[PDB]
Amino acid sequence: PSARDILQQGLDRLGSPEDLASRIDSTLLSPRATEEDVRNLVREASDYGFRCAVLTPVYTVKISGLAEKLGVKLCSVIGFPLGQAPLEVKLVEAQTVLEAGATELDVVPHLSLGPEAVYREVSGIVKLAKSYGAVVKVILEAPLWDDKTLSLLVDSSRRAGADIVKTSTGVYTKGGDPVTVFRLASLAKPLGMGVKASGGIRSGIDAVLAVGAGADIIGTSSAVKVLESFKSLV
Amino acid sequence: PSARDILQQGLDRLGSPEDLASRIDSTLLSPRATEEDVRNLVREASDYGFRCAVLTPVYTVKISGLAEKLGVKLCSVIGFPLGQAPLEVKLVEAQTVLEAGATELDVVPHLSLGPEAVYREVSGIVKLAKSYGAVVKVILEAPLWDDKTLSLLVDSSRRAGADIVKTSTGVYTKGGDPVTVFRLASLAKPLGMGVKASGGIRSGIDAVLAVGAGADIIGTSSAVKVLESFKSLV
Amino acid sequence: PSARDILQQGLDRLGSPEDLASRIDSTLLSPRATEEDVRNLVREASDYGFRCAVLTPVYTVKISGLAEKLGVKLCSVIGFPLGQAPLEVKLVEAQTVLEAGATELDVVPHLSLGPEAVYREVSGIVKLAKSYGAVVKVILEAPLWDDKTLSLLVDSSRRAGADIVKTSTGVYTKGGDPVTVFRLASLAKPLGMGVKASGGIRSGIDAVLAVGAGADIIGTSSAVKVLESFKSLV
Amino acid sequence: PSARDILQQGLDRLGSPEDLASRIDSTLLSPRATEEDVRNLVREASDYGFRCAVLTPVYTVKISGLAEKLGVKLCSVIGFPLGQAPLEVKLVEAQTVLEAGATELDVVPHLSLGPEAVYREVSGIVKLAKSYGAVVKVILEAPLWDDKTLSLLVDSSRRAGADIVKTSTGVYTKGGDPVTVFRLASLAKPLGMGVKASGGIRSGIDAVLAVGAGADIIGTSSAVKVLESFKSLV
């Protein structure tokens, strides 16, 4: 795609602030995040109509009550952000979050073990997830691998039953840029998988470019600012 | 302007690679730059049809012969990048480059001395530049000032007779982003002055966004990559 | 302490490369780390006589056989690096690594829930660790808190029965610098707890400075370079 | 040298705060620096006994009166920080500063033109400088070149009549670290040239390590903090 292609595609897909808001997974995954910050995250998600609230396992559970009351979908990260705890540990972690009402999981598999291990690991998590009717997004840290390796990873995710593939944890890499988004999307979309872009998305512009590049969902810890920035540059 | 506004404005103005190449001030201002590098810069500027080649005073002089032969317009930075040498020094520097054939000057005034001082100083080099029919672009390091102060600097530049105002040196600040570009453009355009965006412009998308925000000229040390990036994202 | 004080204290404690190597927790906690990399880490730990090898739960388990064969002590990070999975999850994770032979745990508690919560949580893993005669190092992300808050965290760690307190995860903060190390040490040592410095320790000089500031143990992903750098600056 | 060597050497040379203060060239070379900041720089230089005040040409001239009254030696940067204005322009610049009372010049030659050009250029500046009994420090941007090239540069400076060689402009590179300081010192000292380290020196510790590595003079824009940091770590 050309530069013009990505800009035009973004414009074709985001006609209104509501369109953008509906694609944003409002996130809070900071070592400093308090219960108060989490409450504010969920309330604002409802206030602005964001796709869902993304939290760590503990806060997902603690805030599930309020989220249910306000009708805010909850997404929890799993084995995040390093992803090198054993499969059993991630399942116990996913279980507690699923039992609490979380309907989506942003999973970090043990990527460095290779495509086959990722397939076996993700399949195990998707299995638990399906029993709750939960959606699984697989974080692939795309900036770390070449295309051949990213393809193998996307394919293992597909074969595992995953719905969406995510570009980055936003910790070890950043994947909110058009190039990284396109690298993942050019592989995921043909297979019918959704695409989530995350990492450094701070402006409405950043958001529109990511969508134009192929992202279906926008992950960001600055959801409100991204939305306001979309409406007005300054 | 909204995020959509700047994207659309960028698309409306840059329909072809030629349109882009025509607005690009291909630059080389590095402590590592060699004569060989400069020859390559000027030759490729000719190859790609870039707006001009931007160089330091010494290389502007050394390459003037080649530039003339290949029909490449030359632009020299003056008092770059700190701008705290006295006017007398800057005038001697400009005089030498003008004597060599440079038709544009990207001047860094002693900004921190205040709007009035900038007015007097720029009025001086503009007077000199005019005798050679050369254009003057005033670098204002926009990211350093609030809107009130930037307006004062833009106004002084206008009063002094300058043609264009530039967002940044790319050294002490980076002003290639849409917000910075708009901040300057919103003030300068109503006054009939041109706007040049510089600082961190590495992709074709960066270029299109800067133009959409109001930049007439794009300054970049990666002219070739920006152009190729414009044609193909990856 | 004065700058001279920390330098002198560092020199007084590290007379030989062996003294240094003996205080180094050779670490590998990367999303890119492969089994091969881990084998190399453990083998070189043996070669250089490093204090132990620090790994993620999965690799701690996979390498336990080799580690035992080469007589390399194993330390696993727990709930690393964000620490916001519930205690139950962290306990399962620790249990598996302890079952494999790990004798030390570098634990990341859910710091942002407050001192009291940290006390209860750490008391839990310490109880488990004790049944295996394993040592527990509590990561406090010192750079994130003021002295009053850090003191509260140090005190909770002490009350919970932890042996050592660690300055940082090396991910959300970097705590290998003398100031951070002293901030922690000034609080922990008077309480009889050990101090581990981690985050950005790349040179032998970084190591000596951290020890001079009060670090008993040095955590680093560049163990070999730190040692060689200790022997020769260049 | 070993890590211990550099720490011990620093301690041998900096026994008191006064020792450190006497080696510090208190600097202010910011695009934001105002006349008020400059006055404060000079007053404090006297207050703490720093070696001298380092300023841009314009401020050197504007503050010379006060500096003379307080007995504060003045050092001006020349052709700083890019160094690619012609020799004649730098001489006019050096002249105005010398005529004002500046007794030291921190010169940035056009390094990328090669050793021979640097020799011819520096000789020209040293010539003007000697007539005022002024000292010349030649900035070599050491981090940019290999040892062979740095040696050629140090030798051209020596042959040119320069007194001191400086590691960095602090703009295009940073040379306050032990490694970079040693690289320059191991070449300069045998030839009897002084050594100035600059770039990122913010702590008393940073200062002591640089001296231990061979720096005779410490350039820093945080002179007061470096000195206070030397006396007390926190």
UniProtKB/Swiss-Prot annotation, chains A, B, C, D:
Catalysis performed (reactions): 2-deoxy-D-ribose 5-phosphate = D-glyceraldehyde 3-phosphate + acetaldehyde
Activity over temperature: Extremely thermostable. Retains full activity upon heating at 100 degrees Celsius for 10 minutes and at 80 degrees Celsius for 60 minutes.
Keywords: Cytoplasm, Lyase, Schiff base
Applied uses, from the record: Its high stability makes the enzyme a potential candidate to be used as a synthetic catalyst in practical application.
Active site residues of this protein: 106, 166, 196
A Pfam family per the record: DeoC
UniProt-listed SMART domains: DeoC
Subcellular localization, as worded in the UniProt entry: Cytoplasm
Subunit structure: Homotetramer.
Other known facts: The enzyme is also highly resistant to organic solvents such as ethanol, methanol, N,N-dimethylformamide, and Me(2)SO at 50 degrees Celsius. Loss of activity is not observed in the presence of these reagents even at a concentration as high as 40%.
Record's protein name: Deoxyribose-phosphate aldolase
Organism listed in the record: Aeropyrum pernix (strain ATCC 700893 / DSM 11879 / JCM 9820 / NBRC 100138 / K1)
Gene: deoC
